[PDB]
Amino acid sequence: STAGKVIKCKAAVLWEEKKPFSIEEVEVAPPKAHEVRIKMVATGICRSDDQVVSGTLVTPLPVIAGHEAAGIVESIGEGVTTVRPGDKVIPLFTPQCGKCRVCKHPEGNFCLKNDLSMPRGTMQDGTSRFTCRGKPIHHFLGTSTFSQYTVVDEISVAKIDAASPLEKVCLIGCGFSTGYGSAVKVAKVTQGSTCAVFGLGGVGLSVIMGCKAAGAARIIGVDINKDKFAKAKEVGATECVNPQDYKKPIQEVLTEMSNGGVDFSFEVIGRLDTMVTALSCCQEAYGVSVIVGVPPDSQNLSMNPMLLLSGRTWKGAIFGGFKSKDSVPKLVADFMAKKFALDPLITHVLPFEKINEGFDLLRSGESIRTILTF
Amino acid sequence: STAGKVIKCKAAVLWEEKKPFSIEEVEVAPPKAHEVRIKMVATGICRSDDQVVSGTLVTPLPVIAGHEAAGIVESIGEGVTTVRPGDKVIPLFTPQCGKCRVCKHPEGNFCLKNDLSMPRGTMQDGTSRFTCRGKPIHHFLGTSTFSQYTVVDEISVAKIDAASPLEKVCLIGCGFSTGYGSAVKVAKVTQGSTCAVFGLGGVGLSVIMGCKAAGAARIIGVDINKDKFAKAKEVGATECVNPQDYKKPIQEVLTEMSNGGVDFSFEVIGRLDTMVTALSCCQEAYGVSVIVGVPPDSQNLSMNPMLLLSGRTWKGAIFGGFKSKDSVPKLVADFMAKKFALDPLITHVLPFEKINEGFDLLRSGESIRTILTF
Ligand SMILES: NC(=O)c1ccc[n+]([C@@H]2O[C@H](COP(=O)([O-])OP(=O)([O-])OC[C@H]3O[C@@H](n4cnc5c(N)[nH+]cnc54)[C@H](O)[C@@H]3O)[C@@H](O)[C@H]2O)c1
Ligand SMILES: NC(=O)c1ccc[n+]([C@@H]2O[C@H](COP(=O)([O-])OP(=O)([O-])OC[C@H]3O[C@@H](n4cnc5c(N)[nH+]cnc54)[C@H](O)[C@@H]3O)[C@@H](O)[C@H]2O)c1
Ligand SMILES: [Zn+2]
Ligand SMILES: [Zn+2]
Ligand SMILES: [Zn+2]
Ligand SMILES: [Zn+2]
């Protein structure tokens, strides 16, 4: 009988860029028509959430960030047909409205109702469900998972298997699905190919998992932090290189290593220089390079279009190119059937109240995914 | 007989940039091992040839330019197995060695023996077959068709149908195959799609022909020269737009016209600014943009990688992604079988001696393809 009532709960509020989260009481309004209020069970720390703190991924402040999570439906608004109270759910930071030209396109997944391209920090109706100290607080990507309760639009939630371990399957809400889809759906990595993966965090390890699933012969991990190399080999990297070890630019090293350039390269960091380097290192006539990393807000890169004229393909994607509401329940079902592993991504577990310690672990280079439990 | 002897003949020599072609007597050495000497019958004037004069496409000078042509084999060197004296042939400015990693790849066509990436202006053996006034003259892309005779490496020539009309099929050497393949093979334009083609010269009109062949529902031609619109409509444009007619940038106009972005865009000009515009006008989640135009030497473009992260694909190609020696004889057979038209591309047919008047017709906006006849 919290149904129809304001919930007072703890959330991690970001009042200001480059400051710690403030764990404090917020007020969470009840769900309006076509909205769902979720009791959160577990949420992951994704670099994109850190980018919001850094100000390199811009979204209105103050905000409740968090987008990689799983919980249990507390109540549904009028007209909700796709989940019920007590259902296990994953919030979808990329919505699936099912009505727009993108949702109807066979390849498209970046639904026109997304809050990423031109962030408002609201529900679909342009208003907020969150109050803190009597002030309105922004949403993030229609999810806001750094809260004991959130409200999402129906197009931004998926029902998942009732027996799902939510402290693992929360990674299906971003990092795993993003990296794995980037390889198997966006790049379409082929059997016997040579891949280069720039960035060996939670998302680039998921890229390596997808390249290995697709049958790549060589998977070259690239990171300036050699501490990331052991786990990258465990999930399928055949060799790892640190650009800081070489006199030559790493695109030239990777071209030499691959006897004239790789089949598939992935930028999984979020830097302009590594996006150009990852394009350059794929073979000039038939190579494919996929941008996964989120670049710093409003900055342009510089490149020589002769890299494309020879035959390269350059593309990017959000959430691994997955249509989110169709894909997430299937990804959970596939996990439950042992088709891929999530434990190799989980390096740390903390209570929600230690969110700032979780961010210090990511920033220090010590963690892959920290999972916070409510 | 000329076989085994030096030929003295007329060629158009470019002694330095931004000067008219010099029509004069050159000496053409006989073919060495795995080389073919061709009597030229017809050659087209491609914008790429004008870019060598402008210095925006760098190749060593002095040079015999020309790459879009057809002629008749005069003689063959030792070891030549794929052509014989008297054969009709098209020189291949993109070779097909059949041995490199690119030639063996199912998609690849930019053979590693090409002279486009790092132009030397020689035969494969690093030497020239041309002298003029006692000076060695460079080759251009392994072809050098602005001459009554040329010598090419065997991997840079294809045998075509003995009954083919050389004054038309010379365009299969460059402009027609490039534009048509860019649409049907590289973009893989789909039935009912909306296409935007930037540049309505010979190559852009050939892109329109491919988009129409692939069953596009809308083909928007873009040119700053409105005199190009009537012919673009004859070959399949459904509408034409001149960016100079609008207060708004044309990417915004084309996004509004296509109710959120086109399925397929093509840059067929060679400008950095229209390469970025063409990418931007394709739908942000599923759009594809192909660079066909040759960009200006050593210059970088500036772009926001968020254009790719949302889901766009950006790619470029040489020669329409056709494997040159396999494809050219099949394109000629397809032409003979009336599967496509070339006459719409041909606005002017001049004797070879009028090469400069041919270039001035292109530069002035008055021609599509001028065919020079020997
Ligand atoms: N496209 C999407 O939908 C999607 C979703 C998830 C994450 N992202 C982005 O993907 C990127 C990675 O996220 P993550 O895996 O959580 O981050 P992470 O755990 O910080 O991993 C990034 C890795 O990059 C390494 N790195 C940093 N700088 C360089 C360098 N110059 N050269 C080589 N390696 C370097 C770094 O050491 C680290 O291991 C971030 O930009 C996220 O914002 C995008
Ligand atoms: N990729 C290949 O294999 C390949 C082969 C053939 C030609 N090309 C290149 O393709 C391009 C076109 O060749 P072409 O068709 O012979 O040239 P063309 O006949 O000069 O056509 C170019 C067209 O672009 C129009 N144009 C020029 N500037 C603009 C502008 N700012 N906005 C809109 N329209 C503009 C112009 O009026 C002209 O109709 C050139 O850069 C060639 O070098 C490349
Ligand atoms: Zn994320
Ligand atoms: Zn949608
Ligand atoms: Zn050309
Ligand atoms: Zn080859």
Side-chain angles (χ1 to χ4, degrees):
Chain A
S1 57
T2 55
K5 297 175 181 143
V6 177
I7 291 170
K8 289 181 177 179
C9 73
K10 299 305 186 299
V13 180
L14 185 73
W15 290 106
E16 235 191 300
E17 288 175 21
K18 297 172 185 193
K19 292 304 182 99
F21 295 95
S22 175
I23 291 279
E24 64 177 289
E25 175 167 280
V26 303
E27 300 182 280
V28 186
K32 299 194 180 212
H34 295 106
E35 295 174 6
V36 177
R37 185 155 69 176
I38 307 170
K39 181 183 178 178
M40 302 310 316
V41 170
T43 188
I45 297 168
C46 174
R47 186 57 71 167
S48 300
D49 299 298
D50 189 55
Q51 293 218 52
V52 166
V53 180
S54 297
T56 54
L57 180 55
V58 166
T59 196
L61 304 206
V63 62
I64 300 177
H67 61 281
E68 183 180 80
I72 299 168
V73 180
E74 164 279 345
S75 67
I76 61 168
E78 282 164 10
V80 169
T81 66
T82 59
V83 303
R84 296 180 287 177
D87 282 349
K88 285 182 182 179
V89 288
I90 292 178
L92 308 174
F93 78 81
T94 306
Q96 183 178 353
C97 85
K99 292 175 176 187
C100 71
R101 213 169 55 166
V102 174
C103 287
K104 293 170 173 308
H105 189 282
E107 302 307 317
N109 78 318
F110 191 52
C111 172
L112 292 171
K113 298 294 198 174
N114 78 86
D115 196 41
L116 178 66
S117 57
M118 304 276 260
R120 296 186 284 177
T122 67
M123 302 289 295
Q124 292 293 328
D125 70 1
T127 72
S128 171
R129 298 282 167 282
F130 293 120
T131 310
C132 184
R133 312 187 187 189
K135 293 157 169 145
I137 308 292
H138 288 101
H139 295 246
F140 179 52
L141 300 183
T143 59
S144 286
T145 70
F146 291 164
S147 182
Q148 291 177 332
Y149 293 83
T150 193
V151 181
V152 299
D153 293 284
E154 184 170 22
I155 58 165
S156 296
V157 65
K159 178 176 173 187
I160 64 164
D161 180 356
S164 302
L166 296 185
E167 79 284 4
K168 303 190 185 308
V169 303
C170 52
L171 291 184
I172 290 158
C174 185
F176 167 80
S177 306
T178 293
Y180 194 84
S182 301
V184 303
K185 179 169 209 73
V186 184
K188 301 166 195 67
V189 171
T190 52
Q191 181 144 65
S193 71
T194 295
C195 296
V197 184
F198 290 67
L200 305 174
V203 185
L205 292 172
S206 300
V207 170
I208 289 166
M209 290 173 178
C211 292
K212 173 176 182 177
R218 299 180 60 189
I219 303 170
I220 306 165
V222 184
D223 202 306
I224 52 167
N225 181 358
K226 70 180 189 292
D227 298 346
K228 299 291 168 176
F229 290 172
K231 176 65 56 67
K233 290 177 148 150
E234 281 172 36
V235 297
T238 57
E239 59 226 285
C240 288
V241 298
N242 183 349
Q244 294 170 344
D245 288 344
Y246 292 85
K247 296 185 185 178
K248 292 168 153 173
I250 199 68
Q251 63 205 37
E252 295 176 13
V253 173
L254 289 169
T255 300
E256 288 170 349
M257 284 175 77
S258 63
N259 303 109
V262 301
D263 299 288
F264 307 92
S265 70
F266 303 82
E267 200 281 6
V268 206
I269 301 158
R271 298 172 51 93
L272 303 175
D273 62 338
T274 47
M275 284 169 195
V276 176
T277 288
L279 174 69
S280 305
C281 78
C282 80
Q283 199 289 323
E284 63 181 0
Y286 55 76
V288 172
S289 187
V290 180
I291 301 179
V292 188
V294 165
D297 182 71
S298 293
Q299 296 189 38
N300 279 13
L301 60 74
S302 173
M303 58 85 70
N304 187 338
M306 278 300 290
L307 288 180
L308 296 176
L309 197 74
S310 49
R312 294 184 179 81
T313 307
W314 203 18
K315 62 207 290 185
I318 304 296
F319 197 50
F322 283 116
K323 287 173 185 294
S324 57
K325 189 158 181 159
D326 293 335
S327 306
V328 160
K330 173 48 163 165
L331 288 161
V332 172
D334 287 353
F335 172 71
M336 291 308 290
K338 307 295 185 207
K339 303 304 186 188
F340 55 83
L342 295 174
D343 288 346
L345 307 173
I346 301 174
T347 55
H348 298 72
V349 297
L350 288 168
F352 175 61
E353 293 72 28
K354 292 192 169 103
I355 185 164
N356 289 311
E357 163 166 16
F359 281 76
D360 302 335
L361 290 159
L362 176 73
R363 292 166 184 149
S364 74
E366 187 188 330
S367 57
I368 301 295
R369 288 291 209 264
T370 298
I371 309 299
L372 302 177
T373 291
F374 290 90
Chain B
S1 57
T2 50
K5 309 186 200 152
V6 173
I7 286 172
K8 293 179 171 156
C9 74
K10 201 181 295 188
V13 174
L14 178 71
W15 291 106
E16 60 187 288
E17 60 168 35
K18 297 175 182 187
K19 294 300 174 147
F21 294 100
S22 178
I23 295 298
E24 50 187 301
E25 175 172 87
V26 305
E27 309 88 36
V28 186
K32 298 197 213 140
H34 297 107
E35 297 180 0
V36 177
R37 183 156 70 176
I38 307 165
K39 187 166 186 205
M40 220 65 55
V41 169
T43 184
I45 297 177
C46 174
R47 182 61 75 165
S48 294
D49 297 305
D50 187 54
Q51 291 216 59
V52 168
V53 183
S54 293
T56 56
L57 177 55
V58 167
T59 193
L61 313 180
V63 68
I64 299 172
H67 59 289
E68 182 178 83
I72 294 168
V73 178
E74 169 274 346
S75 66
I76 60 164
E78 187 180 60
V80 168
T81 61
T82 60
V83 302
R84 296 200 191 73
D87 288 345
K88 285 182 175 181
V89 291
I90 286 177
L92 309 172
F93 75 79
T94 306
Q96 184 173 0
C97 80
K99 286 154 165 143
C100 69
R101 216 172 50 177
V102 176
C103 282
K104 287 163 163 159
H105 188 284
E107 305 305 309
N109 80 320
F110 193 53
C111 171
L112 292 171
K113 294 290 198 181
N114 77 82
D115 196 41
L116 182 57
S117 281
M118 301 257 289
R120 297 190 291 176
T122 66
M123 306 293 297
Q124 286 300 323
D125 72 352
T127 73
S128 162
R129 300 282 168 280
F130 294 125
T131 50
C132 186
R133 304 196 227 173
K135 306 173 197 165
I137 310 295
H138 293 93
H139 294 247
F140 178 57
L141 302 182
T143 58
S144 285
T145 69
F146 292 165
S147 182
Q148 293 179 324
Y149 292 80
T150 194
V151 179
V152 303
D153 291 288
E154 183 173 22
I155 62 165
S156 290
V157 69
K159 182 181 176 178
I160 65 163
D161 169 357
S164 68
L166 294 189
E167 76 281 0
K168 304 182 187 302
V169 298
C170 52
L171 293 184
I172 290 164
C174 186
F176 169 77
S177 309
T178 294
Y180 195 82
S182 294
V184 305
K185 182 158 188 80
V186 179
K188 300 168 192 69
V189 168
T190 56
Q191 179 97 30
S193 67
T194 291
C195 290
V197 181
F198 288 78
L200 306 175
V203 183
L205 289 177
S206 301
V207 173
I208 292 170
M209 290 178 175
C211 294
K212 174 171 180 179
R218 297 182 63 187
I219 303 160
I220 309 168
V222 187
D223 200 308
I224 56 171
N225 185 351
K226 66 172 177 179
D227 296 350
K228 298 292 172 175
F229 294 174
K231 181 63 62 69
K233 299 182 146 150
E234 149 184 339
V235 295
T238 55
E239 51 226 290
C240 288
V241 293
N242 184 344
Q244 303 174 331
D245 290 341
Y246 294 89
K247 304 194 181 169
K248 294 158 147 180
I250 201 68
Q251 64 200 34
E252 184 180 359
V253 170
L254 287 167
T255 299
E256 186 278 339
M257 287 171 73
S258 57
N259 299 108
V262 302
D263 296 291
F264 303 95
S265 68
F266 302 82
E267 202 281 4
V268 207
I269 302 165
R271 297 180 49 101
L272 298 182
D273 71 309
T274 45
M275 295 173 186
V276 180
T277 293
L279 172 69
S280 303
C281 86
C282 78
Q283 202 286 326
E284 58 180 355
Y286 57 74
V288 173
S289 188
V290 178
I291 307 180
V292 187
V294 163
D297 184 65
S298 294
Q299 304 186 31
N300 276 17
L301 60 78
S302 162
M303 59 84 69
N304 189 329
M306 277 305 305
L307 288 177
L308 300 173
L309 195 71
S310 53
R312 299 180 176 81
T313 303
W314 201 14
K315 69 200 299 178
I318 302 304
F319 197 56
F322 284 120
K323 296 176 175 293
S324 58
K325 195 169 178 146
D326 291 344
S327 304
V328 161
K330 295 195 201 158
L331 290 164
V332 168
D334 286 0
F335 174 68
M336 295 305 292
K338 318 288 187 207
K339 299 205 168 167
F340 57 84
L342 296 170
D343 284 354
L345 303 180
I346 305 169
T347 57
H348 295 81
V349 183
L350 296 175
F352 172 61
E353 298 70 22
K354 286 191 192 304
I355 183 160
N356 289 306
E357 295 95 325
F359 276 76
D360 291 339
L361 286 171
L362 179 69
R363 285 165 190 153
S364 71
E366 167 169 0
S367 54
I368 300 294
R369 286 297 208 258
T370 298
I371 308 308
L372 304 173
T373 60
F374 288 89

